[PDB]
């Protein structure tokens, strides 16, 4: 069950994405922001509008991308429709893995314009997901652990509802760089 396509997946919990695959060579603006909070927010918002490209070309792309970057990681190494891949968002600074949850398809890199080399259909979690710190803590990794996508911080009553996300007045002061200070 579900490993071979979830029979009737909820589009209200999982959103169907059709993303253009970029090569790092062509990627304009090779990062979302300076802080993990920003990049996860930029990930979700640009995925819907199609203003985000997906890098799933090679591995040499990634060391040439700007941190924090957001990879598209399967929630399970299983759980995939025929053509669609069920995934979720994870942002990472050093590229250190601490809960890949499966395979990484692509990197989310903003699309200003550029020739796609491939296209990918992935299903992104609208809610119930993310691991920008470490599910297994990366085995005493001690990372920043910032699953707080700027406004949609799911530890303060917020239920991770980025639908109609107006995080304008969430900018206290130090909302720049993973190293706020």
UniProtKB/Swiss-Prot annotation:
<protein>
    <recommendedName>
        <fullName>Host translation inhibitor nsp1</fullName>
    </recommendedName>
</protein>
<feature type="domain" description="CoV Nsp1 globular">
    <location>
        <begin position="13"/>
        <end position="128"/>
    </location>
</feature>
<feature type="region of interest" description="Disordered">
    <location>
        <begin position="2"/>
        <end position="148"/>
    </location>
</feature>
<feature type="domain" description="BetaCoV Nsp1 C-terminal">
    <location>
        <begin position="149"/>
        <end position="180"/>
    </location>
</feature>
<comment type="function">
    <text>Inhibits host translation by associating with the open head conformation of the 40S subunit. The C-terminus binds to and obstructs ribosomal mRNA entry tunnel. Thereby inhibits antiviral response triggered by innate immunity or interferons. The nsp1-40S ribosome complex further induces an endonucleolytic cleavage near the 5'UTR of host mRNAs, targeting them for degradation. This inhibits the integrated stress response (ISR) in the infected cell by preventing EIF2S1/eIF2-alpha phosphorylation upstream of stress granule formation and depletes host G3BP1.</text>
</comment>
<feature type="region of interest" description="Binding to 40s ribosome mRNA entry channel">
    <location>
        <begin position="155"/>
        <end position="181"/>
    </location>
</feature>
């Amino acid at each position: 069950a579900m490993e071979s396509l979830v029979p009737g997946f909820n589009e209200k919990t999982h959103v169907q994405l059709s993303l253009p695959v970029l090569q790092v060579r062509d990627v304009l603006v090779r990062g979302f922001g300076d802080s993990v909070e920003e990049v996860l927010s930029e990930a979700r918002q640009h995925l819907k509008d199609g203003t985000c490209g997906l890098v799933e070309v090679e591995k040499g792309v990634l060391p040439q991308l700007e941190q924090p970057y957001v990879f598209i990681k399967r929630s399970d190494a299983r759980t995939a429709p025929h053509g669609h891949v069920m995934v979720e968002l994870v942002a990472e600074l050093e590229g250190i893995q601490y809960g890949r949850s499966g395979e990484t398809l692509g990197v989310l890199v903003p699309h200003v314009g550029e020739i796609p080399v491939a296209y990918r259909k992935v299903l992104l979690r609208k809610n119930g997901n993310k691991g920008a710190g470490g599910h297994s803590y990366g085995a005493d990794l001690k990372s920043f652990d910032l699953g707080d996508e700027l406004g949609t911080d799911p530890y303060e009553d917020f239920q991770e509802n980025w639908n109609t996300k107006h995080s304008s007045g969430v900018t206290r002061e130090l909302m720049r760089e993973l190293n706020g200070g």
